Amino acid sequence: GSSGSSGPVPATPILQLEECCTHNNSATLSWKQPPLSTVPADGYILELDDGNGGQFREVYVGKETMCTVDGLHFNSTYNARVKAFNKTGVSPYSKTLVLQTSEGSGPSSG
């Protein structure tokens, strides 16, 4: 480290999943900064696995506080996580958020 500049990574965002009970197959993410967030953030990076249970990759990144993904498999567990990033570096992923998807069946009954 150095002894000149002082600015630690931005406080990790809080996964406030709200969009869960929907007809479509899109998981809207609307995280939020903690009440103790002392370090300002410049952006946030999203991550989600391919419902396989391996490694997490980047899905979105910017300066917004609300982003959703389209085209999500059904009857398959999904693990997502959002983090903050700025000039400093990058914050650690949040608490693994599981998005239990309901059995996907074509629209027939009615």
Domains, the chain, with CATH or none: 1-110 (2.60.40.10)
Give the separation between CA 100 and CA 97, rounded to whole angstroms: 10
For residue 51, which amino acid is it?
G
In whole angstroms, what separates CA 98 from the centre of its chain? 11
Instruction: Identify whether the C-beta of residue 56 lies closer than 8 Å to the C-beta of residue 79.
Output: yes
The HSE-up count of residue 77 (CA atoms within 13 Å, CB side) is: 7
Q: Give the Cα-Cα-Cα angle 16, 21, 23 (nearest 5 degrees).
A: 130
Method by which the coordinates were obtained = NMR
